[PDB]
Point group: C2
Chain length 288, copies 2
């Protein structure tokens, strides 16, 4: 598990993740179930299985370069410009060949959600739970041939922050018909470029694409989550992006402990989705 990687189509064990035991809460009024457990709902079990399969398919040395993120926007199918409209009416994993999501949320909604999140961060009873990080970076993509290298530059001190090759490993599309946006959950790799020097080699040539990002990040260490709210100019097309990202460290430690003690892995996933849902719901209630 820790020291191997197997392709998704060849994996045979799925770790058992047990349901939350009826917590030690004041004797409730109603048992949660006749077994006295709270079974995970179907979408959280799916995500738990998918995230485990996809990590277990990447080479152990590559695993600390994992980024697991949820991005908001609308799922569009291969044929039609409009949001997909399967015959379902509650949230679910959406599996249609060529369906895609481009992260982007209405500008007005983005500014009311930013105020909401800023307001939640300043309530005096939760102020030592969040930290706010504001940043402005220019990401430029260079082709080597053919590989695409992304170099990130901070606006103030034009020092190259990150120099990497980003590889898309997998994505789930969550169709959310009660909501004004759907969500894509992505597992990418951000692999640091090797021996190729950043500043020396590519200051000279022209990127094939440049994105400027103006971003406010809210880090909530107690739920292992970060919320990133960004205005991006895509060279120029503007998008407004809202992302939730899980802390990699904590993810890799939970995944390494899955045989030993499934419970850490299972409530990391549960919280990530619970944070996701709060944002999704707040964006839908602001849309009225």
């Amino acid at each position: 598990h820790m020291y191997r990687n197997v392709p998704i189509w060849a994996q045979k064990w799925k770790p058992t993740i047990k349901a939350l035991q009826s917590i030690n809460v004041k004797d409730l009024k109603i048992d949660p179930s006749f077994l006295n457990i709270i079974p995970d709902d179907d979408l959280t079990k799916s995500v738990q299985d998918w995230v485990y399969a996809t990590i277990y398919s990447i080479a152990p040395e590559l695993r600390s370069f994992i980024e697991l993120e949820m991005k908001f926007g609308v799922i569009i199918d291969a044929k039609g410009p409009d949001r997909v409209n399967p015959p379902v009416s509650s949230q679910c994993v959406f599996t249609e060949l060529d369906a895609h999501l481009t992260p982007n949320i209405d500008a007005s909604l983005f500014k009311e959600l930013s105020k909401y999140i800023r307001g939640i961060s300043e309530v005096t009873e939760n102020t030592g739970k969040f930290s706010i990080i504001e940043s402005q970076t220019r990401d430029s993509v260079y082709r080597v041939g053919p590989r695409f290298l992304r170099m990130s530059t901070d606006i103030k001190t034009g020092r190259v922050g990150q120099f990497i090759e980003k590889r898309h490993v997998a994505q789930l599309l969550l169709y959310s018909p009660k909501d004004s946006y759907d969500v894509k959950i992505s597992l990418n790799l951000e692999l640091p470029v090797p021996d190729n020097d950043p500043p020396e080699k590519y200051k000279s040539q022209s990127p094939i694409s440049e994105r400027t990002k103006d971003r406010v990040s809210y880090i909530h260490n107690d739920s292992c989550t970060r919320i990133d709210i960004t205005k991006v100019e895509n060279h120029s097309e503007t998008t407004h992006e809202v992302e939730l990202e899980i802390n990699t460290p904590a993810l890799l430690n939970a995944f390494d402990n899955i045989t030993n003690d499934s419970k850490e892995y299972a409530s990391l996933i549960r919280t990530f989705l619970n944070n996701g849902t709060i944002i999704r719901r707040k964006l839908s209630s602001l849309s009225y």
Copy 2:
């Protein structure tokens, strides 16, 4: 709310049902969310809304005749004999014109699930939680014209148990693609026939349909639920039916308290679905 009934298309207030607060459990290792709440998942919120709308649309005097049940079987669409196959991959409310479910589960599965439930009822630590009721009844449907009256007769002492008019008010279809069966959630009315005598009037004439039911019921008062496992001969076509039914009393008391204290209504629903899910999952794991 209590003393009115409004049609579904005309209802304007939806009660707010709050998320479970981070229970008083040993300080967990991970906050459940950045708000410190556990938002309800989308299918439980849907069911909570649907059940409230549908009760609120029935006339207050008719409400104690409500039966809220979950039945297992497969959703089939209008055109094709096979189980529906929308492009989704986790459980969701399934909304396709003319889609239908006929309650019926493989005979072999039904006998292994009966053993499982009997085994769960006899574990010494949960034996004062369940009671088992075995019964054999013949239900005969008579048309008056045109209304259909169902009279129920117990096999031993051929005394007519129930004499009623059953009215279907609504149904939700839950598409469960990870499972071997789907579920239909139904809200019916079982209205007791008025002044028409049972034994005198219809011993003479012939029913338009007769069903014999051999049933074992497991009553779990602490979760307000009953599990009913029945072999039915439909005059003769045999079906094997598995149903979960919520206790009406408790449902009507929770619904009456929804403005005052939403939490009873919300965890009655949550448990019903949690019980449903255990049965669904056990039926799917027995199917391998």
